[PDB]
Structure formats: C-alpha cells, structure tokens
Structure 1
Amino acid sequence: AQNPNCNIMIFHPTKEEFNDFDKYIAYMESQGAHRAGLAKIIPPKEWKARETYDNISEILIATPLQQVASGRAGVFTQYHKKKKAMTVGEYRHLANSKKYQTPPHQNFEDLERKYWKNRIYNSPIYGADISGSLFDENTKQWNLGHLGTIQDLLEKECGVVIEGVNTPYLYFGMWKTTFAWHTEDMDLYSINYLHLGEPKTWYVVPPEHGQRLERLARELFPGSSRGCGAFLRHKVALISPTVLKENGIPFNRITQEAGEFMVTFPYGYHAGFNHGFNCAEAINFATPRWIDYGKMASQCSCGEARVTFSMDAFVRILQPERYDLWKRGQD
C-alpha cells in the first residue's frame, strides 16, 4: 500500500504532465497521496495563472465576515458577523493596518505558535466565498474555472443527468482568518490555488481516521453534538494541534505559499489559517473514486449548514433515503 503513514505528499509536475488534470489526480492517488487527505502541487515553472494581479483592487467583497471566537485557545468556535461591503483595495489596507497586520515573527513555526496562543483574542475579517475567478481565460492548464463539472462526472459514471452548476470561489484573507474543521460538501474533493500574498497553513486528518476526529469533536463540543448529528458541517469548530496530539488524533500540517495548489481528498477533514493578506481561489470537483464517498457522506439536517443549489441533486440521486429529511433542513 502506497503512503501507509498518510503523509502529505508534494508534487512537481512537468509542463507536459500539467496538461491532463484528471490523469494527474489519478497519478497522485496511485502514489498514495489521498491517504493524507491533502496534497500540495507546485506548478511547472513555465506556468502562470495570469499575467499580473495589478488590477484586482476593484473586486467587491459584498459581505466581509468578522470571525468572533468563543471558548479556550485550543478549543473554540467562531461565528461570522456580517460587515459592510468593501473593495479588495479597502480590505487590503485594513489587513495591513496596525490592528490587523501580521506580528513580527521569526519563521512559520513561531507564527503558528502565536496563532494558537492568541487567535481567540482577536476577530479578523475574512472575505470568503465570493463567486468568481482570477485565472486568465487563456490559461489552459489547471484553470479552476475550466474544470469538468461534478454534474458531468455523475452523468458519465452513473448515467443520470442532473441540474446544477459548479463554479469557483475567491477568498481574501488576513492574519488569523480561520477555516474551521470540515470536509467538503458531499465529501467532494477541493482544489485551492493561492494566487497572491501571504501563506496559508493547513491541518488535515487522513480520511481513514476521520471518525476519530468526529468522536473527539462530539466530546469537545457536547451541546453542538446534541443539536446536530453532523455539526462539523456548520464549519465553526476549531481544535488546535496540541489538543489533537493530547487526544491521539492522527493529523498532518503544511504551509501553502503563493503560486501553489492544494488538493483536499474525499472525507479529508481540514482546518487552517492565513498568515497575512492573501487571495485564494477554490472549487469542488469529483472523480470516479468520489462516488462512494458521496453516497456515504453525512449530512446536517438541523438547518444550520444551508448549502448550494447543486447539492440538492447530489443528495437526491446518491442518498434518496435521506433526501426528504435533508430537504426539510434546507427549507
């Protein structure tokens, strides 16, 4: 069995190997990459996502989210308070202000220590989940707006034709902005490209051990667990590496830098934080190997997780018993 310790693998495709996205994903899995839950892909040196970022300040962040924490430094939840709209130029200036900017630090490790010590005492503002793309239309390789759609994958594998669309999302981050522990909707893959700015640190639990993280989360967030049988779908809970290590939960960590892709694999729980002002683009995708994960994915029916239009069909076709109850949650 390849990668039996479930280490995060790093790939360096050549420009030739960068042509066929599906084939490269399947290659990485042949090497055991999925066992980690997360892989890094460094593009060939010849590739570029677009020519310059010199003209992005006019993108609007219609609903910036202030991420307010509750709990203790290593075990906390965050709620998202909606803020007034601002442009990316306005948000970048805010990120760089004395109140929000990255503190002085020695290296990524020192910064990680400072994040876990101090995150809860601040409320950074995240421009998350903005429909759009920063890939040039002329970028033909690994262009996250030109991927094969999940609807088409389901049609190709299973013969069924369904409504829905699959588009990318932009994320504008600042120091301490946080993504809580989650898997993707319907335990899909994700791919994330860091277009510019400061790094993003990721934590990940191997898919084969995801249920160990779930059991810990039920113990650490006991009221949330009674409220919902899949409350990590709410995307609000944080657990630090120190707490994971104290509880024996297998995990890995890695830092993504500008110019690099990350892939998350079906049922790979992940969480993380941004080092400073940055912009990422991400989208969900599927392969044939996902279908069985999609059939088994948990679902939030308490009503909190409230998701996209396109998830309806995935539930309807892959999980027809749950359909009914899950849709009561969404309506």
Structure 2
Amino acid sequence: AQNPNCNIMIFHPTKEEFNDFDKYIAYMESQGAHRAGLAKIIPPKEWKARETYDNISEILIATPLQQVASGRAGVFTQYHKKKKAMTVGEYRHLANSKKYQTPPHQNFEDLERKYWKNRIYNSPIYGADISGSLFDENTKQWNLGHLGTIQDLLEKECGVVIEGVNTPYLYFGMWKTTFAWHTEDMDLYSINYLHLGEPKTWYVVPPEHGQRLERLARELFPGSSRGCGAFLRHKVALISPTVLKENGIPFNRITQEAGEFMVTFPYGYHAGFNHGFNCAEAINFATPRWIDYGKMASQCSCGEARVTFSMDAFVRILQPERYDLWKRGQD
C-alpha cells in the first residue's frame, strides 16, 4: 500500500506532465497522495497563471466578512458578520494597517504559535466565495476555470445528464483569517491556487480517519452536535493542533506559499489560516474515484449549511433516499 503513514506529499511535475490534469491527479493517487487528504503541487518553472497582478485593485468584495470567535483558544467557533463593500485595493490597505497586519515573527512555526495563542482575541475580515478567476484565458495548463465539470463527470460515469454549473471562487485574506474544519460539499475534491501574497497554513485529517475527527467534534461542541448530525458542514468549528494531539487524532500540517497548488481529496477534513494579505482561487472537482464518496457523504438538513444550486442534482441522483429531507433543509 503506498504512503501507509498518510503523509502529505509534494509533487514537482515537469511541463510535459502538467498538460493532462486528470492523468496527473490519477498519478498522484497511484503514489498514495490521497491517503493524507491533502497534497501540494509545485508548477514547473516554465508555467505562469497570468503575466502580473498589478491590475487587480478594482475587483469588488461585495460582502466582506468579519470572523468573530467564541470559546477558548484551542476550541472555538466563529461567526461571520457582514461588513460594507470594499475594493481589493481598500482591503489590501486594511490588511496592512496596524490593527490587522501580521506581527513580527521568526519563522512559520513562531507565527503558528502566535495564531493559536491569540486568534480568538481578534476579528479579522475575509473576502470569501467571490465568483471569478485570475487565470489568464490563454493559460492552458491547470487553469482552474477550464477544468472538466462535475456534472460532465457524473454523466460520463453514470450516464445521467444533469443541470448545474461549476465555476471558481476568489478569496482575499489577511492575518488570522480562518477556515474552519470541513470536508467539501458532497465530499468532492478541491484545488486551491495561491495567486499572490502571504502563505496559508493547512491542517488535514487522513480520509480513513475522518470519523475520529467527527467523534471529537461531537464531544467538543455538544450543543451544535445535538442541533445537527452533520454540523461540521456549517463550517464554523476550530480545534487546534495541540488539542488534536491531546486526543490522539491523526493529522498533518503544511504551509502553502504563493505560486503553489493544493489539492484536497474526498472526505479529507481540513482547516487553516492565512499569514497576511493574500489572494487564492479555488474550485471543486470530481474524478471516477469520487463517485463512491459522493454516494456516502453526510448531509446537513437542519437548515444551517445552505449550499449552491448544483448540489441538488448530486443529492437527487447519488442519494435519492436522502433527497426529500435534504431539500426540506434547503427551503
């Protein structure tokens, strides 16, 4: 069995290997990369996403979100308070202000210590889930807006044509902006490209151990667990590496820098934080190996998780028994 300790693997494709996306995902899986839940892909030196980032300041962040925490330093939830619209140039200046800028630090480990110690005492502002792309239209390799669609994958594998579309999202981050513990919708893959700026630290639980994380989360968030049998779908709960280690939960960590891709694999729980002002692009995707995970994915039906238009068809076709209840949750 490849990668039996479920370590995060890092790949360096050549320019020739970077031509065929599906084939390279399948190659990484042949080496056991999916066992970790997360992999890093460093593009060949010949590749670029676009020519420059000098002209992005006029992008609008219509609904910046202030991430307000409750709990204790290692075990907390966050809620998202809506703020007034601002441009990417206004947001960059905000991120660099004395109130929000990254503190002085020695290295990534020191900054990680400071994050876990102090995150709860601040409320950073995040631009999230902004439909759009920063890939140049002429970038032919690993262009996140030109991937094959999940609806076409399901049709190719299962024969059923369905409605829906699949497009990328942009994220603008600052120091302490936080992504809560989650898997993707319908336990899909995701791919994330860090376009510019400061790093993102990731934490991940191997897919084969995901139920261990869920059992801990029920113990640590007991009211939330009573409210909903899949409350991690709400994307609000944080648990620190120290707390995971105290409770014997298997996980790994890695820092992504600008110019690097990360792939998350089906049912790989992940969480993390941004180091300072940055811009990332991400999209979900599927492969043949996903279909079995999609058929088994939990679902939130309490009303909280509320998701995209395109999830309807995935639930309807892969999970017909659950469809009626899930749809009540959506309405």
Following superposition, the deviation at residue 9 of structure 1 comes to: 0.1
Separation (CA, whole Å) in 1 of partners of 2:252 and 2:209: 12
Separation (CA, whole Å) in 2 of partners of 1:275 and 1:171: 14
Aligned to 1:23: 23
Separation (CA, whole Å) in 2 of partners of 1:59 and 1:311: 27
Following superposition, the deviation at residue 289 of structure 1 comes to: 0.1
Separation (CA, whole Å) in 2 of partners of 1:306 and 1:6: 32
Separation (CA, whole Å) in 1 of partners of 2:251 and 2:59: 36
Following superposition, the deviation at residue 324 of structure 1 comes to: 0.2
Following superposition, the deviation at residue 22 of structure 1 comes to: 0.0
Partner SS state of residue 90, structure 2: helix
Following superposition, the deviation at residue 78 of structure 1 comes to: 0.2
Where do 1:89-238 residues align within 5 Å? 89-238=89-238
Following superposition, the deviation at residue 184 of structure 1 comes to: 0.1
Partner SS state of residue 233, structure 2: helix
Separation (CA, whole Å) in 2 of partners of 1:323 and 1:303: 14
Following superposition, the deviation at residue 226 of structure 1 comes to: 0.1
Separation (CA, whole Å) in 1 of partners of 2:40 and 2:238: 22
Task: In structure 1, list runs of 5 or more residues that go unmatched.
Answer: none
Following superposition, the deviation at residue 94 of structure 1 comes to: 0.1
The superposition leaves residues 98-145 of structure 1 with CA deviations (integer Å, 9 ceiling, x where unpaired) of 000000000000000000000000000000100000000000000000
Partner SS state of residue 279, structure 1: strand
Partner SS state of residue 289, structure 2: helix
Partner SS state of residue 18, structure 2: coil
- Let me know the Cα RMSD of the aligned residues: 0.1
Following superposition, the deviation at residue 46 of structure 1 comes to: 0.2
Following superposition, the deviation at residue 205 of structure 1 comes to: 0.1
The superposition leaves residues 183-238 of structure 1 with CA deviations (integer Å, 9 ceiling, x where unpaired) of 00000000000000000000000000000000000000000000000000000000
The superposition leaves residues 47-68 of structure 1 with CA deviations (integer Å, 9 ceiling, x where unpaired) of 0000000000000000000000
Separation (CA, whole Å) in 2 of partners of 1:63 and 1:129: 10
Separation (CA, whole Å) in 2 of partners of 1:317 and 1:168: 23
Separation (CA, whole Å) in 2 of partners of 1:253 and 1:126: 22
The superposition leaves residues 8-64 of structure 1 with CA deviations (integer Å, 9 ceiling, x where unpaired) of 000000000000000000000000000000000000000000000000000000000
Following superposition, the deviation at residue 79 of structure 1 comes to: 0.1
Following superposition, the deviation at residue 260 of structure 1 comes to: 0.1
Following superposition, the deviation at residue 174 of structure 1 comes to: 0.1
Following superposition, the deviation at residue 240 of structure 1 comes to: 0.1
Separation (CA, whole Å) in 1 of partners of 2:62 and 2:294: 31
Following superposition, the deviation at residue 171 of structure 1 comes to: 0.3
Separation (CA, whole Å) in 1 of partners of 2:108 and 2:2: 29
Normalised by the length of structure 2, the TM-score is 1.00
Following superposition, the deviation at residue 73 of structure 1 comes to: 0.1
Partner SS state of residue 321, structure 1: helix
Moved beyond 3 Å, runs of 4+:
none
Following superposition, the deviation at residue 306 of structure 1 comes to: 0.1
Following superposition, the deviation at residue 292 of structure 1 comes to: 0.2
Separation (CA, whole Å) in 2 of partners of 1:257 and 1:115: 17
Following superposition, the deviation at residue 154 of structure 1 comes to: 0.1
Alignment length, in residue pairs?
331
Separation (CA, whole Å) in 2 of partners of 1:28 and 1:73: 36
Following superposition, the deviation at residue 276 of structure 1 comes to: 0.1
Partner SS state of residue 7, structure 1: coil
Following superposition, the deviation at residue 271 of structure 1 comes to: 0.1
Separation (CA, whole Å) in 2 of partners of 1:241 and 1:38: 16
Among the aligned pairs, what percent are the same residue? 100
Separation (CA, whole Å) in 2 of partners of 1:108 and 1:120: 19
Partner SS state of residue 283, structure 2: strand
Separation (CA, whole Å) in 2 of partners of 1:104 and 1:225: 38
The superposition leaves residues 144-180 of structure 1 with CA deviations (integer Å, 9 ceiling, x where unpaired) of 0000000000000000000000000000000000000
